[PDB]
């Protein structure tokens, strides 16, 4: 017979992308193959994510939510608040009063959505709205999560008792240097501290081993590029085209610092913000401490010293006091994230802006993809042809997504805001905004990592942005003008909200103590 | 002064043409879901049941609609001679000769039989445990059969042992055989009875309509004249509102199916002599295939056939013989077969369900699904008297999403067949697969699932995930299609391997277990209907 198994794999970068390739692959091959990292030897602006990380990276790795907290002054997220997306005018963390007197505010919480009849409370919500029967926001209405947020309250008790859905704030890097040492010291992942020189490639164009600094040539049989936006193999080495999709995103840049925070005067907010601007938007994500913050925005209608001026203007910083990392975006994605021997991952791969928190999925869902579809030497097309077909589909799902929290924004007062107006929506999301305006619902949720990544933007997340920018059904339901007893229903589940809300914002300790509390 | 709210144009009466299972499952159906705002009828002419009855069905019947309904599982099983099916038995579907009720022998010894049953499949480190069965055949280190391998329900149906325990303790999955008409009789009682349905034995003779198109009644025999907001085709493969009178096309799909007709009976049985086999049989022919659907005291069977390998007395002896029947002697039903679906299943206030909306032959026992499937998306989709296009649209692109899914899963069960010993074995091969089922052989191929499910066990859920990755692989390797390799990733995790062989141990001893704890599927009959 043969043995045609993969015996290397070389790793080519660091960050939160090459160690958790190195740490997820390191388990997922069982000590069966050698693990090879190339990285270079290298501010904590902070960085978000959605809940489904301890179940699909961290407990696959046995490492305990609490342990990797401690390490990167990791916070609590229940949601993205969205702050001055309907209103004209300067940044400001303060929301503007709409003319209902109420706040520029809306939640995209993680919350689930009950239902009645089969039928989402977003959907007996919007049918009293369009009939003059409530005023009330659709955050406030169909989520206890709202009071949580608006107390700034945890979503665990002093115990650790679960009391809400939520994801994580935390230092990145802090993130990475955990990882790379658990997949040093306990997975004997060599770790190579050296800058690459050269790809070596056979005459199948396959890569056969990587040139180092020093003189090494690292030897592999599958690679995968954790090189960043560069894209050094797969693009590079293997002459992969990149899709430029700013023809649906208009964001390319970004300007950001660690901001030092007043816990104890102002609290912690357990929530993501996402501060509107005249030419993007700015990211708050709380930590203990401090919070990292960075302005997003497209550079062909700020410059970046304009973009810094408005960022510092903003927080009230001192320019030439504060230190600022800046970074130019590639959106988009690969023509195909495979291609031969090499696998791209995270920003070598795609990549949107961080308006949704995706980032770290997108990494942790290609890894999971690349176990599942793991090769062997033969490379067959169809594993490749499948990995691909998923991370194309995943990643162009959220294109779409993002771009309609920009499309449906109301603000018309900046060429910013003007121009994504101008920009055309693809197929897919056009389908679904034609389904939403009929008031039917918008992928229905279904309740397994596969039955999650199958149905990751499902119905509650379209209401949130959606109705939280003001688009609404052209009418309700139809199938509710036949149900006074499922209405009727609908209205206990709204009692349910405002009363557990009540009772959790009473009960709950304020997210600054837990804080406290876990991190000594 | 009035409002002019939306919700004062609503659907107010509903007009369903036709009874049966499709009519009566409407009615009942609506009747719950409108909550007594809308005014439903159901007309139908007094007819007699044809000879032959045995239905089988899938096993989300119960949460699904009966369930819905509010009708405990013993109570309408009582009401239709009903009986348990753990599996469909696939005989002879691999080797040649005239049609057979006892199994061939293949080359490597085994017997020509593979079932398809409803078990889950479990999984060791993501992946399922089909996979280690395939890794084993193909590296050579077992001979043993996926179905064998794999599901406990295997051993229990080889010892025609029931679901379920004396004391209703479920023992495996299962799904249900029974008269479908006495099922629709008692849908009707229930329909009119608690529902306030109006049943009205009459024939139609005239579809009224307006000149949009739109129908506005129905005219009957009687001379009353039945007026609708909404009609629900349910007359059968005559699609009298779907195509005659809106004059929807039908698409043909026999390009996918060949066989077009059956020929059935219903077969006293000496239940005490052989006991009751809890599953349908699919017994392979020489121009089709014949099902045995057990109930108490008899089975229903009947060959599917194409009419254009045998004529309908070629079939009606072929399938005699293969139970002994005098061909002279015996009351047959002839049925011609429309298989396809119409082009849109759902026309202005016109939707189609049940055989009038489309048709494959009983080889996965889908028909009672496809019905009320359709009436739980008609209920999601349900219009005003707008009849928003967005609304029809969607409810149509459901419709031909799930026919044209199941369709594909039954063409494989032929085109993956190795026989080549008739016409029509060999004819099947000339039969293009669609791109759909071409990417999900491709898959397989590769070693790859096929559709993981998304429930270690929702209605939603189940429809957008129905044909999954153990179905595949029953029916795949059950024929003796096989992945050209092992799932590649199997080679570097030796731990999964070991994991998965506690799993197939886990297999025969919960297999032996229950088939000495027990009862037979007889004798649990026997209690269930005294």
Not at 137 to 149: H, L, P, Q
Not at 382 to 393: H, S
């Amino acid at each position: 017979h043969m043995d045609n198994r993969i015996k290397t794999v070389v790793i080519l970068g660091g960050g939160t992308a090459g160690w958790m390739t190195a740490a997820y692959l390191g388990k997922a091959l069982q000590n069966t193959v050698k693990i090879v990292v190339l990285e270079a030897p290298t501010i904590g602006v902070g960085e978000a994510t959605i809940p489904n990380l301890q179940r699909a990276f961290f407990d696959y790795l046995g490492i305990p939510e609490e342990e990797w907290m401690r390490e990167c002054n990791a916070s609590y997220k229940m949601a993205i608040k969205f702050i001055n997306w309907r209103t004209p005018g300067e940044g400001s963390p303060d929301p503007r009063t709409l003319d209902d007197g109420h706040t520029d505010t809306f939640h995209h919480p993680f919350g689930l959505l009950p239902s009645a009849d089969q039928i989402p409370l977003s959907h007996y919500w919007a049918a009293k709205r369009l009939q003059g029967e409530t005023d009330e926001n659709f955050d406030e209405a169909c989520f206890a999560d709202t009071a949580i947020m608006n107390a700034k309250k945890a979503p665990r008790f002093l115990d650790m008792r679960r009391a809400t859905n939520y994801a994580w704030h935390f230092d990145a890097s802090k993130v990475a240097a955990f990882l790379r040492n658990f997949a040093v010291t306990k997975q004997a992942v060599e770790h190579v501290e050296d800058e690459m020189t050269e790809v070596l490639t056979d005459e199948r164009g396959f890569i056969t081993a990587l040139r180092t600094k020093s003189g090494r040539i690292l030897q592999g049989d599958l690679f995968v590029d954790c090189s960043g936006f560069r894209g050094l193999l797969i693009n590079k080495a293997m002459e992969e085209p990149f899709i430029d999709m700013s023809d649906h995103l208009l964001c390319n840049s970004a300007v950001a610092t660690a901001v030092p925070h007043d816990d104890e005067k102002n609290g912690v907010e357990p929530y993501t913000s996402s501060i509107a601007m005249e030419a993007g938007w700015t990211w708050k994500i709380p930590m203990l401490g401090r919070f990292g913050s960075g302005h997003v925005y497209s550079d062909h209608f700020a410059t970046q010293d304009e973009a810094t001026l408005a960022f510092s203007k903003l927080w009230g910083l001192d320019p030439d006091n504060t230190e600022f990392n800046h970074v130019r975006f590639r959106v988009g994605r690969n023509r195909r994230a495979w291609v031969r021997n090499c696998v791209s991952v995270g920003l070598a791969s795609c990549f949107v802006e961080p308006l949704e928190s995706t980032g770290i999925y997108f990494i942790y869902a290609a890894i999971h993809m690349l176990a599942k579809h793991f090769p062997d030497k033969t490379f067959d097309k169809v594993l490749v042809d499948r990995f691909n077909r998923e991370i194309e589909e995943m990643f162009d799902d959220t294109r779409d997504f993002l771009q309609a929290h920009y499309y449906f924004s109301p603000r018309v007062d900046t060429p910013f805001w003007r121009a994504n107006k101008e920009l055309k929506l693809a197929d897919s999301i056009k389908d679904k905004v034609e389904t939403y305006r009929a008031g039917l619902p918008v992928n229905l949720p279904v309740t397994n990592f596969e039955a999650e990544f199958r149905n990751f933007w499902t119905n509650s997340n379209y209401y949130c942005i959606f109705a939280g920018l003001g688009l609404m059904p052209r009418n309700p339901l139809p199938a509710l003008a036949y149900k006074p007893q499922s209405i009727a229903e609908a209205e206990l589940l709204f009692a349910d909200v405002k009363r557990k809300g009540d009772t959790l914002v009473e009960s709950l300790p304020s997210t600054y103590d837990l804080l406290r509390q876990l991190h000594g």
